[PDB]
């Protein structure tokens, strides 16, 4: 079985890139034919981004000498601008003109999960319906190959032109293949502009040094493919052969030496004996009507029957095989099957909350690992455009210029899915302890709750004043 799937013995990058197309193609096959990939990407979406992905700008006020109040007001301005620019209802923020920021993050994270890499391009849109002429078009991974599909070279390696030190200079984007009859032409695309401008945002997780591509799926999913095939076929055979039945006719006849002599005489010159016996047996079956049930017994003149003696008859064991292996690959691939297909077998209280909190912290890990890159890159490009357009005003006491301290000025964090609910009592006792001991700040409280302290305080002011005015109890 190791024949149809073969690992070379070498560093992972040189063991994957030669068989990149086959592994990725069979990955496409399984993610299309199989529901597990859809469920996994959907849960990753709903744990990492969830409803939305919220920007929070925190310029390094302490290091830059900027006042915290000026930083906070400038952040208010940039947050209002960014939310109003992102909430465009006409899907107009993409060059394809059919994806908002939500689906920017969606397709980016999905493709960085599947192929391990995502490709964003900051292009200059001309549609004047918005103040900001920068859109972000996502680039397929099929596009990145060496110019004219040539094999890897000295410095042109699977489509990326690098130096001897590996520094990613640029890329050869092959032309799109949709419809299925466009030819591919390779075009030069630099990774970033010299001034720090993020033109081609290439975010991938390298497992080792010098690696150019991300992680796969199929190269650990062939075994589900062939287990589902084998369980499927074995259930089919079991079902079809629980009551397969042979309906033949035998007789006494069979006078050993006499039967053999009759057969030999028929073979030599006395076939009339066989013809007469066949006629008698045909008359037998047409005067009997030899019929078993609703159907006719298949015509068998005496002396021939099937021997449907069977193989071993122990239990198939597939039960504990499949539970063990589903277990196995479930906290292999990472998301547990007791919800990837939802068993409720013997699961208990500590079971539930321990599994939930470890899995949720681990999704927080993946979120902070493979979402903040895209978030910061897009925010940096948008903030550069805003500074170009003088939408928001930089602090006058800027210790470093915007172009010099884009990292310092464009320092930001992002908020993923909403408020976690698992037990209730858990979150509420945590909340009461934090609010009584002061062990929670504005920033981490809002991180835990998916809200904002400024708005909760303003709305509590509104709550109290409306209760006082209408006669309610604050």
């Amino acid at each position: 079985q190791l024949r149809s799937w073969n690992p070379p013995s070498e560093s992972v990058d040189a063991a994957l890139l030669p068989n990149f197309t086959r592994g990725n193609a069979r990955a496409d096959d399984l993610v299309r034919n199989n529901g597990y990939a859809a469920n996994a990407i959907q849960l990753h979406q709903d744990h990492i981004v969830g409803s939305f992905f919220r920007l929070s700008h925190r310029p390094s006020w302490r290091y830059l000498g900027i006042g915290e109040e000026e930083a906070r007001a400038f952040s208010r301005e940039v947050e209002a601008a960014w939310k109003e620019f992102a909430e465009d209802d006409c899907c107009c923020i993409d060059v394809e003109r059919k994806r908002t920021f939500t689906m920017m993050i969606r397709e980016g994270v999905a493709m960085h999960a599947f192929n391990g890499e995502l490709f964003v391009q900051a292009t200059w849109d001309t549609s004047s319906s918005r103040l900001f002429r920068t859109q972000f078009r996502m680039v397929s991974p099929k596009r990145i190959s060496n110019p004219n599909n040539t094999g890897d070279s000295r410095n042109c390696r699977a489509g990326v032109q690098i130096n001897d030190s590996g520094a990613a200079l640029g890329y050869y984007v092959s032309e799109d293949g949709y419809p299925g009859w466009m030819p591919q032409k390779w075009t030069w695309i630099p990774r970033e502009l010299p001034g720090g401008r993020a033109s081609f945002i290439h975010v991938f997780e390298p497992v080792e040094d010098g690696q150019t591509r991300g992680a796969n799926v199929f190269y650990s999913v062939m075994e589900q493919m062939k287990m589902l095939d084998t369980l499927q076929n074995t259930q089919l055979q079991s079902a079809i052969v629980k009551a397969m039945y042979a309906a033949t006719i035998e007789s006494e006849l069979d006078t050993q030496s006499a039967m053999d002599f009759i057969l030999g005489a028929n073979s030599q010159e006395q076939r009339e004996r066989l013809t007469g016996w066949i006629g008698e047996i045909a008359a037998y079956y047409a005067a009997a009507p030899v019929r078993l049930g609703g159907a006719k017994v298949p015509h068998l003149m005496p002396g021939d029957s099937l021997n449907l003696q069977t193989a071993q008859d122990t239990d198939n064991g597939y039960s504990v095989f499949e539970q063990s292996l589903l277990r196995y690959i479930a906290a292999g691939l990472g998301v547990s099957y007791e919800q990837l297909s939802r068993n409720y077998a013997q699961m208990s209280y500590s079971t539930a909350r321990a599994s939930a909190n470890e899995s949720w912290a681990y999704f927080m890990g993946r979120r902070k690992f493979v979402a903040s890159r895209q978030a910061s890159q897009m925010f940096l490009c948008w903030l550069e455009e805003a500074i170009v357009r003088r939408v928001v005003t930089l602090p006058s006491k800027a210790r470093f210029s915007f172009q010099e301290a884009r990292s310092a000025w464009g320092n930001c964090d992002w908020i993923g899915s909403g408020r976690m609910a698992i037990d209730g009592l858990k979150e509420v006792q945590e909340a009461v302890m934090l609010i009584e001991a002061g062990l929670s700040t504005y920033e981490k409280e809002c991180a835990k709750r998916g809200d904002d302290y400024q708005e909760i305080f303003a709305q509590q002011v509104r709550e109290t004043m409306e209760r006082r005015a209408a006669g309610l109890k604050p």
């Binding site: 190791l2 024949r3 073969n6 070379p8 094999g151």
Partner: protein, 335 residues
Amino acid sequence: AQLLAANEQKFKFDPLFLRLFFRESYPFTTEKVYLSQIPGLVNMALYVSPIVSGEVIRSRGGSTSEFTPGYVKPKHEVNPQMTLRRLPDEDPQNLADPAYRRRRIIMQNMRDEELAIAQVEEMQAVSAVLKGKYTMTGEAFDPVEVDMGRSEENNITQSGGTEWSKRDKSTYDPTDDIEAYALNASGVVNIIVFDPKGWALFRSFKAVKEKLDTRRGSNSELETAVKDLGKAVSYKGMYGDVAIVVYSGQYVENGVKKNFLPDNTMVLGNTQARGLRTYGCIQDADAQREGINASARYPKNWVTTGDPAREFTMIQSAPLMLLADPDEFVSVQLA
């Protein structure tokens, strides 16, 4: 079944015919060879008056433009049941791998394949420049004679009149015959490659042996070619003005082996004679839908499901290599 790109050899070692006289490759998207379609030699003299310019010049309509290329598509099995060619002690553990055994056995299989087509192509070449006639033939196929048009003075024989065997082994000089056959060759001859015993009775004359220079006196890249193919081309040395070579190549046919060269033959001509490598259509659905209908060769590794449920390596080609000028070489049978 492995991909098309697993066709890396870097082994092009044809015996100085398809690489030196017959460089002029013309793979087509069409079945036959259309010599009218090939420009070949261009009408290459006339100018126009210093007032205006003249008519449009075309490919000058070759008289005969219809011959059948030798569409050769053999195959083999690479069934992982053999112990293979084990290069000395490079970790036979990978041979123990079915993956490495299968890939280097498709390597071995396919290399046998192109050297097979190369040796049949060399038989075509030796027929071509030894008589001007080529037998496009095979069972369940009509024998088409493809003639470049070798003239009678290009087929004049040494046994006619006085034979070199029937001459003085000491005082007679066959150089006179050398220019006698070289004059009607439409050019200068600079290689006198013989078959072995032909060169034997050539050198039997003393005048030959004290006229020839055994020294290198490296004239051209022919010494480099001999160093490359030290197998069957033998650079005897200088005969002074001209280079002396001997070809003793052999083809190993269905049950026996025998030399490419006949008993005693010669072709007098240049090293830069024009040789066409017209190539026909490649009848493989893969080749057509990926555009390899006009190419040199096509490999593939592929699995049969059903009765011959196995896996094979298939090689397809269609050469009809000929010589542009059959009169360029004078073909002589020797004493």
